[model samples]
Target chain A: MKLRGKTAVVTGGAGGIGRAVTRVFVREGARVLFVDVDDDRGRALESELTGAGGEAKFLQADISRRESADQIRDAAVAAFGGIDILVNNAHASRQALLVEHTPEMFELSFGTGFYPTVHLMQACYPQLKQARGSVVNFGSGSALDGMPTQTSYAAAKEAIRAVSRVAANEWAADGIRVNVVCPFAATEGVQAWQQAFPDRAAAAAAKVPLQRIGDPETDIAPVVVFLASDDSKYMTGQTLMADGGSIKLR
Target chain B: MKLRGKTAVVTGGAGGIGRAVTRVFVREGARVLFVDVDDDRGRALESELTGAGGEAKFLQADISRRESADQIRDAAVAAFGGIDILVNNAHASRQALLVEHTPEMFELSFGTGFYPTVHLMQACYPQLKQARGSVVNFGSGSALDGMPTQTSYAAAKEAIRAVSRVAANEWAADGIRVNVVCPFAATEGVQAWQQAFPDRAAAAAAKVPLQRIGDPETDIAPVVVFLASDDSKYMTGQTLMADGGSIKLR
Candidate 1:
């Protein structure tokens, strides 16, 4: 009941990490409005949450557009009154060498990865300020290490991080807190890659002190819940590598 | 001659910290193509380096434009046959609160701070990959700490960091490395600020372990030179705080 009486708006609510985040927020007693492009998945999630006696509304919207974000905000307001927590966790990444990275890729990457976060935040600004809300955005270790083929993805993700920092500072006076999390989880994408390269997967897993990838719900969600709740009240403008200690932050 | 026969290009090469980097690179036996919009100061430094028998050339260009960056690359190739190092050091920052930050300010801040970095890096990629070159971009502690009134500046600076990290990872196979430096130096800007707020500056200085800000030449340039040289050969995609230990990086 950490978020009892609070309202949370989660992006990409039907997918891997976002699904877990949505569940956790709802379970913790928040009235949640989770938006996603997949109508079937979104509808399923809404039914599941309601069946479990949690308050949730699924709004199907492609969050890449500013207008879509505006609609999502309106939906949240109509459904739950005001937003107390905003989780920006929806993104699709494409791997390409920087030299081979196309301008269109950059447009799509930033549109899906960075701009939605910005637009959503801008949409939720009034409610966030009024409620002194918390925002949890996702960063990536791929950008941190300059991983092999994630040029556009890494750039957009990192740009959001920069935006988060600025927003954190600007909104602090109004009690709106912002922070970023870089997660290394066994999502659908990672699972497929692991199946294809077991040896590489094993080597990677063995490298982390935790010795395993995260369960989206068990491991990642709790950290986000902490950030969104009053538990992480003193923290803001920080990047937490919730990646099983793979990339340590000092 | 730490950089004997190597070729380097530095942005903002006529200003306070940029001048320091230019002088040190030339001193270390690199043929430097240092560009700046400040014609008088840039040419004066160019003449000064030539007079001292060190190889240095000045180019007047607004690097915020892609064309200018391409031109700079051409000058580097024409002057020294190839490029081994690039330092994206030129940025003009304007302080404003996040709420007060405008689209125009965002454009200007990114234009002067982030876009130049991207354009120059793209322009230098082929040469950098060919020569196994290194790149050092600037980050800011203001963003890290969520400092007030640095909204646009901090965001642009941090965005470049993301870009640097991506390039570091993407170009590693090509033998090109990218890293970031965050410095708190006694530059002309800081000097003026210190004079205006003597007590606040002194208190800030007292908090740093070194109890003072860094000198452009003695303190900051050496670190950049190290990154530009083979001494930091194995390192890439990292942020080095050369700010008298004012901020710590884990």
Candidate 2:
């Protein structure tokens, strides 16, 4: 019950890593408003949590729009009371070569991957300041590794990281902490990628010392929970590579 | 003559760390075309390098403009035949609190810091790919540490880093390597900062294991030179912290 009595707003909260995050936060005794564009899946999760004696709600939203940020923020405040933690976990990016990457591609990635987090940070600033809350942003190992055909995704994710770093410093006075988590987890996203490129996935896994991808709930969710909870109070503006030692930051 | 017969292009090459990079590349036997907006300083340095028996030229241009990147590419091709190394080192940023930061500030920082690198990377891609070149972009410890009041600068610098990572991966097949350097050198910029905030500067210095800021010539330049040279052929998409051990990456 690390987050007992706290409130959290998790984006992309219905699937894969987002689902794991929602489940973990609920189990920890936190009231959570989980937003996702997948209405059916989100509603199902919400019902599951409620049935399991946890406090959680589902809100369908396309976070790429500026209005969606405001809507999500209002919903969090209305449903959960106030935000004590924000997990910016939803991101979508197109894979293309640098020369072939278009303005539209960049915008999609920026809108979905970067702006939502920025808007959320701004909208939830006052609440987070009052609560002395925390923010967990997602970065990707692909960006760090410079994976081919992921130019837009890599740029957008790293841009989010940059913003988080600035927030960690700028909002320090308000006691709001910010950090990034780069996880290589077993998620539907990774499975889809693996399905499309099995050999590439194997090659990527072979590089990891752990010799396996992580369990979203067991491995990545615990780290996100730690970041959102007081357990990681001393850490800010740091990038934690939860990738089974695939790419060491040092 | 570590870089003998090579050609390099260094942005903001008339000032601070860029100046040192220019001198070093020249000293190590590379023909260098350095771009800067300050015509007076740029001309003087060009003369100095020529007088010192080093192959160097200075181009005055605002790299934030897309066309400037092309001019640089043409000039490098005309002056030095082709570019074997590119150092995207110039960045302009305004400081402000995250709450107070404006769109203009972000655009300024992005245009000057991130866009220039993108344009230059794109413009030089063909030459670099043909030459099997390397790129060394600049990141900052300020961003890494989340230094207060550096919201725009931190974001822009980190964004450049993100771009570099993607380039490293996408261009690896072309035999072009890309990496980033996060340095804390005693530049005119640091001096200005020190003069403005003496106490803060002193406190920062106390944290460094080396107990001093780095000399651009002796400390920072060598690292960039190595990254651009064959000595680091096996390295790509990495960040080297050349900051007196102030911030350990691990």
Candidate 3:
């Protein structure tokens, strides 16, 4: 277990990508904190990890709201006594145009999808600074792939990366490493997207030289665990596209 | 003289990179309208390009406000009867911390540094689609370099790249290529930055593989010209780091 005895938090932990991150953290022996606004999923996830002999706890919060993130931090600190890693993995996005997009939607996109990253950094800064912790932000190939019908969602994710890069730069001096993973896992969101537009997904996925989707366990999680551990200590201010070579460097 | 016969609107056209791009476009036989908030510099630039026997026009605007962009669009439409290329080059970025960063700072960053790209797209969409025109946005490697003391500026540039990627995808079907250039140029801005910390500037520039500050005309503008031309017809949603290889992009 790469993260044995380390305490970590994964925001949006009930979601597909977030769940996978949580499982990886737990399996690596980290006392895991799973956070999400999905009540039922949160409850189910807490039980599932705990039943598997992993130290897991689910905390509920509307992470978009600034105050909620403070509570999230307090909960984690009270349970684990400190912080080693934070995965700002939760995001809510809708594919629409600027005309169809409202201020509420824009704020929601930036708030949960990006600002929690800012806020979580705030909440965990002291501890992460002390422990020289790692922060893994979830990125998407959207910015690279330039997925249509997702203008604002792509903006939010890029905004998160924007912060991660800045954080990686600023905090690297403090011995904290900030990284982003743009995983091409076959998650529920991806499945829904594939169902919505079969041809687009197939064509985009085919662009990868690897010619296959990523698995949460073998492909995405392993890379993430490496990032979470000391193996990636030298890397910061980097966004990795873990999409089976889908987004090969130009 | 790659932009010959092409029509371009360069906001912030009198300063730094915008000026470099303007010179390249004019030399390339393109008709140009150089827009800038600085009326004196804008007029001077127009005279310089015109005296150099190139087609050029200069307009002054407060692009942070919506009215100016609409007015600029109307003028361009009236002058040439259509738009072909838009260089979203206007910039209003300074440095600030996240906790101390003012909301107005963010708003201004988005307004001047980000919105112009989106607004220009909306303005040029019809003609761009007709002519299969392209857009070149000015992104900074600051996010990648993690430029210390420039968090707000990095975020703004990163936002520009994010918005550009999505816009590229949204408009790719129309044959309009969108790309970002993060040039480490020896422009006015770089001069001011260097002046502020001469030791750091020399040290950093010394480390760049090219072993010198950037040359706007040859190093920066030529690459941008390539992106603006059919050479990049097949490429979109990419950020070209023309930083003298300052960023070890592995």
Candidate 4:
């Protein structure tokens, strides 16, 4: 309810997840901006939302670059004058076996998947401190189950856990609420990856008692709403796995 | 079943938990050397076991010290000619509010509570590696769900989490399995602490789905024995909060 007139920025905005979050934020009456390096998808989403009379924009910036983190924050403020919620959901990871992982793969994993969240935090700290804004750091359950081949991706998410803890504890005085969200919803990413490992994917998602992945509008939004709202005021410095109970630890 | 003639050392052997572990080990037909600072209980328990034809020994040593760690290892070696299982269970924590915490309190808190497990790992690494034995770290769910005035104690148990993780990861190659047991059990310590705050005690313990704190003999021992034996050979680098699933994390 408090987010009705707020401005929210979600990195990786042109992708399926980014678009889903953008749509919901706009429906909640919040002006939303999204970022992705894809020119085609980016422009399409921006035009679609504008056609629908929703205040939405897409920035074509490679967020894996250090400068992009600040640009997204500054652009949001310049567009809407202030930021109330920052859902920093941007990442890309290559499945690399640990012992055989190359520097490029590692860098991409940490760069796109890890540092963006950290940089977003640094860029948003002042505004987060000002508005008492909440941050949802996207994570994956592979970070906990230690599923092989995704070690780098899992490690990146694990780093988010430590960052969330320190930020939550240090900024408790500033009323900054930070948490990690391990979302394993049935998105394009899941569908594409699941094509390769059908059995494991079926078993993994099937364990979710709700028998569903993420329903962006219903399942994931309620959690985002809880963390976004005052309902989770005392529940900072925590990790939330929105995987339909598939993950018991984030 | 192979433990019929093996040697095992259980620190805090005179205490409520150490005694229970000792009984389970002896029942498995292992030669158990029980170490404790309380000489009275230690000696009496030694008689209680030996009088019943169970192979047992009593050793008086404060396991919090590095010297005691080596000495206990030696005593077990001298008694049984070899060490097969090392159970690090000696610990103590005084209840104090988080804001009221002192450096001395923190030091004493970790020095006795967490350090022994680490030191024991250091002391037993060579033998455990040679014996291909296991390590069980005792943790409390109090850190997961905070205790009213035992914040200092809560902090120490949390520290052991990393110790367990590192040891589990580091020694996995040597066939040394390390797992933690977090039990919401009604031990001597819990009962005493519960008396001080009856309302908080009930509320915290009742949070578990099992609806009751554990019994050391039934709930705790079976799990620990399973971990110590080859039964839990597949499990390593894991922290199990076996408080009747009372404290679920995601």
Mark the regions of model 4 whose C-alpha exceeds 4 Å error after superposition: A1-250
| Candidate 2 whole-model C-alpha lDDT, 0 to 1 | 0.85
Task: Find the 10 residues in a row with the least total lDDT in model 2 chain A.
Answer: A230-239
Give the candidate order by descending lDDT: 2, 1, 3, 4
Q: What is the full ranking by TM-score, best candidate first?
A: 2, 4, 1, 3
lDDT of each candidate versus the true structure: 0.82, 0.85, 0.76, 0.74
Give the lowest summed-lDDT range of ten residues in model 3 chain A: A241-250
Total clashing pairs in model 4? 5
Clash pairs of candidate 2? Answer: none
User: Candidate 1 residues B87-203, lDDT tens each?
Assistant: 999887666678888888888889998999999999999999899889989987767877776788888988998888777767766777787878777787677767866776787
Candidate 1 runs further than 4 Å off: A1-250, B195-200
User: What value does the interface RMSD of model 4 take?
Assistant: 13.5
Candidate 2 residue-wise lDDT, A121-178, digit = tens: 9999989998999999999989987888789999889898899877876776677878
Model 3 residue runs over 4 Å out of place are A1-250
TM-score of chain B of 3: 0.93
**Which scores better on DockQ, 1 or 4?**
4
Question: lDDT tens string, model 3, B1-250?
Answer: 4566778777888988889888888887788787898888888988899898987888888888888777777877777666678888888766655667887777878889888778877877887888888888988766777767667777788888888777776776677767777777787877888888788778877755434566777667766776676534444666666665455232
- What DockQ does candidate 4 have relative to the true complex? 0.03
